[PDB]
Amino acid sequence: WTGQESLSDSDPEMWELLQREKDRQCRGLELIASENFCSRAALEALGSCLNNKYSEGYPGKRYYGGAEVVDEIELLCQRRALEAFDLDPAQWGVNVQPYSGSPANLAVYTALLQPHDRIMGLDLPDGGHLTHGYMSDVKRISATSIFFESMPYKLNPKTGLIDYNQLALTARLFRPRLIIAGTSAYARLIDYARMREVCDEVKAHLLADMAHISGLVAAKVIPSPFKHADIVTTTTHKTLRGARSGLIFYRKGVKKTGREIPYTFEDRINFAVFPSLQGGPHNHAIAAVAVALKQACTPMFREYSLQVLKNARAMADALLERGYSLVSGGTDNHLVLVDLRPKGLDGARAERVLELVSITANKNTCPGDTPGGLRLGAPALTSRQFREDDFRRVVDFIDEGVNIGLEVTAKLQDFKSFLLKDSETSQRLANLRQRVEQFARAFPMPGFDEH
Amino acid sequence: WTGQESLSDSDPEMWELLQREKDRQCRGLELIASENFCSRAALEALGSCLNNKYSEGYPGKRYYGGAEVVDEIELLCQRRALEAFDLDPAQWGVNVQPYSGSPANLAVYTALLQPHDRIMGLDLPDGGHLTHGYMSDVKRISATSIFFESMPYKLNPKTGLIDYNQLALTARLFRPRLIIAGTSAYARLIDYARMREVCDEVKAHLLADMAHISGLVAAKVIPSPFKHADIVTTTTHKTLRGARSGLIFYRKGVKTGREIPYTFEDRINFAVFPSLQGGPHNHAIAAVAVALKQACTPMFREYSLQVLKNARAMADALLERGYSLVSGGTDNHLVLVDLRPKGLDGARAERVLELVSITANKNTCPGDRITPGGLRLGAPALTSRQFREDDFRRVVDFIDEGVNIGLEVKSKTAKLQDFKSFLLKDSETSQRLANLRQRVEQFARAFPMPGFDEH
Ligand SMILES: Nc1nc2ccn(CCCCc3csc(C(=O)N[C@@H](CCC(=O)O)C(=O)O)c3F)c2c(=O)[nH]1
Ligand SMILES: Nc1nc2ccn(CCCCc3csc(C(=O)N[C@@H](CCC(=O)O)C(=O)O)c3F)c2c(=O)[nH]1
Ligand SMILES: Cc1ncc(COP(=O)(O)O)c(CNCC(=O)O)c1O
Ligand SMILES: *Cc1c(COP(=O)(O)O)cnc(C)c1O
C-alpha cells in the first residue's frame, strides 16, 4: 500500500457509485434552485493535498507553523472574494473558513449576539431558510432558534412579496438585535432599502444571506445587498458554481466627540469562526472556492448569470403562457415560484412524478392552506449552456409530467404507488423519462467526465 | 467555457500554489500529531461530482429527490464505519454527516443537553480539546463554553496522567450531564472503565472523543472506548487517514420487566440536520467511506502497529539524548516532550524546527499556567510515508540539532520577537539553518507520499 493507487483500482465499489451519480446528473434535468455543477478546476483543488494541512488560526496568527502556502491560499481566496462582488478592502473584510452555509450563519449570531438574543428572519414556509431562526408550533427546529430567540416575519399573501410593513410593525415590538435579509424560495428581489430602514430604526443588525443569489450578485445583474447590509453571508455553491463551503462578509473600518466610531465586526466574526465554533479549516475547499471565485470575476460568468435570469424569465413566461400562476407574478432572480393548485394539483405530488422522469425539483409552500407549488431552478441547467428554447422544452417536459400528475388517487401514498405500480401508467413512465434523458444527455456537463 | 478545463490551464496562480504546498509536504518532516497524508483514492472522491448533489435529510427520508445514488453512498459509509470499529449494527448507530470534528461534538451537546447544561472535559492546557468546554480566566473561548456550562478536570502534575480521583470528587460537586473522555495532547491510554464509573455515579453521559486515536482503535492496537462509552465522536482525518469530516457513533437498542431503551439515534440525527447543518458534503462522505474501507484491511493494522512502534522509538530516542517526557513516555501515536530541563521553551523550539522543515507545535507542560515549555510530536504522518523505527531515531537527531540551534540563539537574544527575527537576519545562524533544512529536506523527499503526485 502506497496511498497513490487509483480509486477505480482500490475501491471499485465506491468508483461504481461515483459513476452512477455522474450518469444520473448527466441524464437528468436539474431544476432544484440551490444546485449547480462545479467546474473541474475547482474539484481538482477540492481533492488536493491541501486536505493534509491543519492550519488553525488565520494568516499571520496561526496556532502553529508550516502554513507558508495555505496562508497565501487563504489570503488569495480573501482577495478574490472581495473582487467577485467589488468591495473596497478598507470597507469590507471576508472570512473564508465557514464549512458551509449553515455554519456561516451560526458564526455570525455567535459573533454579534449573546445567547437568547432576538433574531428576525423570513419564515421557512414563506421562503426563508432554516438557519434564519425557524421553529414550528411544536418544536424548535434550527439550532439558530435554540441558542437564540427568533420571531419570523411572513409573506403578504396578496402580493406574494415580503410584508415589509408588518415587519417594521413587529420589529419595534420584538426589538431584535439582528434581522436576516435572505431567502431560499423567493422569485422577487429583496427590498434591502426597507430592511435597512427597519434595522436602523429598531437598532438591529442587517444580515444579508445571499446564498441563492450570490452568483447573480457577483455578475452585477441584480442589486447587490452590500450597499445596505453590515454582514453578508453566502454559500459558495448554489449559483456561485463552486465547492460546498461558506463565506462571511463584514463591514470594516469606520462606520459627536469628533473621534471615529469604528466597525467592531472583524474581530468578533473571526473569533466566532475560530476558536469558538470550528476547528481546522478545510483548505481544499478554501482553494476550490478561490478557483470558482476567480471564475466569477470573468466576463463569462456575467454572460452565464445573465443567461440564468433569461432562462428563469423565459421559463416563467413559458409556464405563464400555459396557464400557470407565479407567486409574486413573475421572477427577477434565478428561480420561479410556481403556484400549482390553480391548475389543480400541489407540490408534493408534482415533485415525485418529475423525479421519476429524471427531473429534479422541490415542493415549496405557496401562500395558501401539503405544499402548493414547486421551486424550479435555472442555474443548474444554465451551466450546461442551456438557452431559452431549451428551457421551453424543459417546461414542456415538466408540464407533460404535471399533465400526467393531474391524471395520476386520493392520498399521497396512493399517488406514490399508482406512479410505479399501475402497469399502463408505468409504461408512460419509461416513455417520458427516456426522451427527457435523451434530450438532457446531449448538453455538456462541467467537471470530470468519469466522476 | 465548458467547466471541464483543467486547473493548470484555468488558474495557473492557484495551480502554482497547490504545487508549492505539495513540495512542502514532500520535503518536510511532518510531526504534527493531528496531521496525516490522505490517500489518492479518497482524494478522488473528495473532489468529485458528489459536490453537486443536495441531499438534505437522511437515506430514505430526504427533503428532495434524486438522491438515489448518494443514499447508497451514505448507507455504505455507515456500514464501513461500523465494520471499521467492529460494531454491532443492532447495538451501535453512526451519523456520517458532521462537517468536521468540532461540528460533531457540538451536535452531540445540542442533541443531548439543554442550553447551559453542564459539561466536563480535560482542560485544554492539560491536553483536552477546545470543543471539550474550554474557557479561560477572562473569556469564553469555545462555543462549548457559551451555549453550555463547562468545568474542566485536570492532570496529576506528579504523574502527568488524568487525575481520575479529583475528577470523581469534582464531578459529584459539579454534577455534569456529560463528561468527555478524549484528548488532543495526551500520550497515555484513557481509563474508559474508570470514566464510566464516574459517569454512572453522577448519572452523566460518557462521550468518547477518540479523534486522535480513531485509527489505533479501528486497528485494535489499543483498547476501544466503544466498550464503555455511550457516544463516540471522531474526526475522519488524523490516524484514520481520510478526508476532513466527522462521525458520531451512538448506542442503540435496549440499555418489573421494563427494559429501558436507548434514545440517542433520533436526538443525534436531528441535531446534525435540520438543527445545525444544511446539505451534507457527499463528496467528503464518500472519501470517508473510502478511508474507512482502508481501515478494515490487514494493511491498516500493520500501519497502526508501526505508528505505536515509531512513537515509542521517538520517545526512547528522545530519552537517550537527555530529554524529559510528560507521563514518562507514550502508549499511543504521539509523544509529549518536556523541554524545560534542557533550557528552551516550546515557542522558540517550534519556530526553529519550522525553519528546518520540521513541523511541530508547542505544548503546555504540567507546571506552567506562561510560554509553553514543551512540544508535541506525532508519528502518524511520517509513518504513512513508510518511516520506520530507525527513521524516527534519525528524525530525533535532526530535532536535537534544531534544539541546540535554538539554545545558541536564545543566549544571543532577548524577547521572543527578537528571537524569531534573529533566525532570519543573522547570517551565521541563517547559514546554519539552511544546512540543516537542506539536510532534512533531502532525507524527507526520499520517502514515498500518498495522494496525487503533483497536487
Ligand atoms: N423555503 C425553503 N425551502 C427549502 C427547501 C429546502 N430547504 C432547506 C432544508 C429545509 C429542511 C427542513 C425545514 S423544516 C424541517 C422539519 O421540520 N423536518 C421534520 C422534523 C423532524 C425530523 O427531521 O425527523 C418534520 O417536522 O417533518 C426540515 F427538515 C428549504 C428552506 O430552508 N426554505
Ligand atoms: N492541548 C491542545 N492542543 C492543541 C493544539 C491544537 N489544538 C486545537 C486548536 C486550539 C486553538 C486555541 C486554544 S486556546 C486559543 C485562544 O484562546 N487564543 C486567543 C483567543 C483570541 C484569538 O484566537 O483571536 C487567546 O485567548 O490569546 C486557541 F485559539 C489544541 C487543543 O484544543 N488542545
Ligand atoms: C479530540 C479532538 N476533537 C476535535 C478536534 C478538531 O476537529 P476539527 O476536525 O473540527 O478540527 C481535534 C483536533 N484539534 C487540533 C489538534 O489536536 O491538533 C481533537 O484532537
Ligand atoms: C442553501 C442555503 C443555506 C444552507 O447552506 P448549507 O451549505 O447547506 O449549510 C443557507 N442559507 C441560504 C440562504 C441558502 O440558500
Alpha-carbon span B445 to A329, nearest angstrom = 64
In sequence order, what DSSP letters do the residues of A133-193 get, joined into one string? Answer: T-B-SS-B-SGGGTSSEEEEE-B-TTTSSB-HHHHHHHHHHH--SEEEEE-SS-SS---HH
The technique by which this structure was obtained is X-ray
Going by C-alpha positions, the residue among B215, B214, B195 that lies closest to residue B205 is B195
Alpha-carbon span B189 to A173, nearest angstrom = 56
Catalytic residue, candidates A149, A209, A317, A400: A209
| Interchain contact, A288 vs B24, CB within 8 Å | no
Phi, psi of B330 (to 5 degrees): -160, 150
Query: Exposed/middle/buried for A423, CB within 10 Å: 0-12, 13-18, 19+?
Result: exposed
Integer CA distances (angstroms), B57 to A77, A133, B70, B278, B285, in order? 30, 18, 11, 9, 14
CB proximity list for B269: less than 8 A, separation 6 or greater? B58, B95
What residue has cell string 478574490? A80
Alpha-carbon span A436 to B7, nearest angstrom = 32
Going by C-alpha positions, the residue among A181, A237, A240 that lies closest to residue A209 is A181
Cis ω for the linkage preceding A275 (within 30 of 0): yes
Integer CA distances (angstroms), A107 to A145, A278, B141, B338, B430, in order? 14, 9, 13, 36, 42
Alpha-carbon span B332 to A241, nearest angstrom = 43
| Interchain contact, A277 vs B384, CB within 8 Å | no
Chain B: nearest CA to A200, how far in angstroms?
Answer: 28
> Of all helices (H) and strands (E), which one includes residue A95?
strand A92-95
Alpha-carbon span B80 to B74, nearest angstrom = 10
Integer CA distances (angstroms), B35 to A55, A194, B168, in order? 10, 49, 33
Going from the Cα of A424 to the center of ligand 1, the distance in angstroms, rounded, reads 34
Integer CA distances (angstroms), B44 to A31, A337, B450, in order? 27, 37, 12
Integer CA distances (angstroms), B239 to A326, B53, B358, in order? 53, 29, 19
Per-residue cell: B360 = 511541530
Contact between B376 and B333 (Cβ < 8 Å): no
At residue B330's C-alpha, the angle toward residues B329 and B332, to 5°, is 175
Per-residue cell: B57 = 435529510
A3 vs B24, B50, B450: nearest CB: B450
> Of all helices (H) and strands (E), which one includes residue B246?
strand B246-251
Going by C-alpha positions, the residue among A34, A102, A49 that lies closest to residue B99 is A102
- H-assigned helices in A222-298: 266-271, 283-296
- Strand, helix or coil at A20? helix
Phi, psi of B324 (to 5 degrees): -105, 145
Q: How far is CA A444 from the centre of its chain?
A: 23
Residue A50: DSSP 8-state: G
Per-residue cell: A220 = 452585477
Per-residue cell: B22 = 505539495
Per-residue cell: B48 = 468529485
Q: Is A209 a catalytic residue?
A: yes
Alpha-carbon span B65 to A361, nearest angstrom = 7
A241: which chain B residues are within 8 Å (Cβ-Cβ)?
Answer: 3
The radius of gyration of chain B's CA atoms, rounded to the nearest angstrom, is 23
| Interchain contact, A280 vs B354, CB within 8 Å | no
Alpha-carbon span B369 to B61, nearest angstrom = 50
Going from the Cα of A134 to the center of ligand 1, the distance in angstroms, rounded, reads 9
Alpha-carbon span A71 to B191, nearest angstrom = 39
Which of A9, A48, A108, A150 is the best mutation test for B, with the most CBs of B within 10 A?
Answer: A48
Alpha-carbon span A331 to A313, nearest angstrom = 6
Beta strands A231-235 and A205-209 are: parallel
Residue A390: DSSP 8-state: H
Beta strands B161-162 and B178-181 are: unpaired
Which value, to the nearest 10 degrees, does the dihedral of the CA atoms of residues A27, A31, A32, A33 take? Answer: 140
Q: Does residue B244 belong to the interface with chain A, where contact is any CB pair within 8 Å?
A: yes
CB proximity list for B80: less than 8 A, separation 6 or greater? B289, B292, B293, B296
Q: How far is CA A393 from the centre of its chain?
A: 25
φ/ψ region of B91 (left if φ > 0, alpha if ψ in -120 to 50, else beta) reads alpha
CB atoms closer than 10 angstroms to residue B370: 10
Residue to substitute in A124, A131, A144, A289 for testing ligand 4 pocket (most ligand atoms within 8 angstroms of CB): A131
Q: How far is CA A304 from the centre of its chain?
A: 17
CB proximity list for A347: less than 8 A, separation 6 or greater? A340, A362, A363, A364, A365, A366, A370, A371, A372, A373, A374
Q: How far is CA A380 from the centre of its chain?
A: 12
CB atoms closer than 10 angstroms to residue A117: 15
Which amino acid would we find at residue A207?
Answer: L
What residue has cell string 497513490? A4
Phi, psi of B209 (to 5 degrees): -100, 90
A52 vs B5, B36, B453: nearest CB: B36
CB proximity list for B15: less than 8 A, separation 6 or greater? B7, B8, B455
Going by C-alpha positions, the residue among A215, A132, A142, A146 that lies closest to residue A181 is A132
Catalytic residue, candidates B44, B54, B83, B267: B54
Q: What sign for the dihedral angle of Cα B69, A431, A349, A213?
A: positive
Half-sphere exposure of B237 (CA within 13 A, CB side): 29
Alpha-carbon span A53 to B455, nearest angstrom = 13
Cβ–Cβ pairs < 8 A, chains A and B: 334
Phi, psi of B387 (to 5 degrees): -70, 145
Going by C-alpha positions, the residue among A216, A209, A159, A163 that lies closest to residue A335 is A216
Q: Does residue B130 belong to the interface with chain A, where contact is any CB pair within 8 Å?
A: yes
Which of B9, B48, B424 is the best mutation test for A, with the most CBs of A within 10 A?
Answer: B48
Contact between A114 and A280 (Cβ < 8 Å): no
Going from the Cα of B209 to the center of ligand 2, the distance in angstroms, rounded, reads 18
Contact between A406 and A343 (Cβ < 8 Å): yes
Which amino acid would we find at residue A103?
Answer: P
Beta strands B324-325 and B334-338 are: antiparallel
Query: Exposed/middle/buried for A321, CB within 10 Å: 0-12, 13-18, 19+?
Result: exposed
Strand partners of residue B181: B208
Alpha-carbon span B350 to B360, nearest angstrom = 6
Per-residue cell: B423 = 533566525
CA end-to-end span of chain B, whole Å?
Answer: 23
CB proximity list for B445: less than 8 A, separation 6 or greater? B26, B27
Length of chain B: 455
Burial B279-302 (b: 16+ CB within 10 A, else e): bbbbbbbbbbbbbbbbbbeeebbe
Residue A308: DSSP 8-state: H
Residue A94: DSSP 8-state: E
CB atoms closer than 10 angstroms to residue B406: 25
In sequence order, what DSSP letters do the residues of A330-379 get, joined into one string? Answer: S-SSSEEEEE-GGGT--HHHHHHHHHHTTEE-EE---S-----EEEEESH
In sequence order, what DSSP letters do the residues of B326-392 get, joined into one string? Answer: GGGS-SSSEEEEE-GGGT--HHHHHHHHHHTTEE-EEE--BTB-----EEEEESHHHHHTT--HHHH
Residue B62: DSSP 8-state: B
Contact between B205 and B179 (Cβ < 8 Å): yes
- Strand, helix or coil at A121? strand
CB proximity list for A137: less than 8 A, separation 6 or greater? none
CB atoms closer than 10 angstroms to residue B326: 27
CB proximity list for A65: less than 8 A, separation 6 or greater? B350, B351, B353, B354, B359, B360, B361
In sequence order, what DSSP letters do the residues of B92-107 get, joined into one string? Answer: EEEE---SSHHHHHHH
Contact between A81 and A218 (Cβ < 8 Å): no
Q: In chain A, how many H helices and how many E strands?
A: 16, 15
Q: Is A54 a catalytic residue?
A: yes
Alpha-carbon span A53 to A42, nearest angstrom = 18
Q: Is B56 a catalytic residue?
A: yes
In sequence order, what DSSP letters do the residues of A394-443 get, joined into one string? Answer: HHHHHHHHHHHHHH---SHHHHHHHHHH-HHHHHHHHHHHHHHHHHHHTS
Alpha-carbon span A58 to A78, nearest angstrom = 11
Q: Does residue B20 belong to the interface with chain A, where contact is any CB pair within 8 Å?
A: yes
Integer CA distances (angstroms), A253 to A75, A88, B71, B289, in order? 19, 10, 47, 45
Domains of chain A, earliest start first:
49-296 (3.40.640.10), 299-441 (3.90.1150.10)
Cis ω for the linkage preceding A59 (within 30 of 0): no
Contact between B333 and B323 (Cβ < 8 Å): no
Per-residue cell: A109 = 449570531
Contact between A143 and B271 (Cβ < 8 Å): yes
Alpha-carbon span B295 to B308, nearest angstrom = 16
At residue B244's C-alpha, the angle toward residues B132 and A283, to 5°, is 105
What residue has cell string 459513476? A19
Contact between B338 and B219 (Cβ < 8 Å): no
Integer CA distances (angstroms), A55 to A252, A255, B30, B89, in order? 24, 32, 13, 36
Going by C-alpha positions, the residue among A421, A413, A386 that lies closest to residue A314 is A386
Q: How far is CA A130 from the centre of its chain?
A: 12
Which of A71, A130, A244 is the best mutation test for B, with the most CBs of B within 10 A?
Answer: A244
Q: Does residue B275 belong to the interface with chain A, where contact is any CB pair within 8 Å?
A: yes
Going from the Cα of B275 to the center of ligand 1, the distance in angstroms, rounded, reads 10
Alpha-carbon span B184 to A379, nearest angstrom = 43
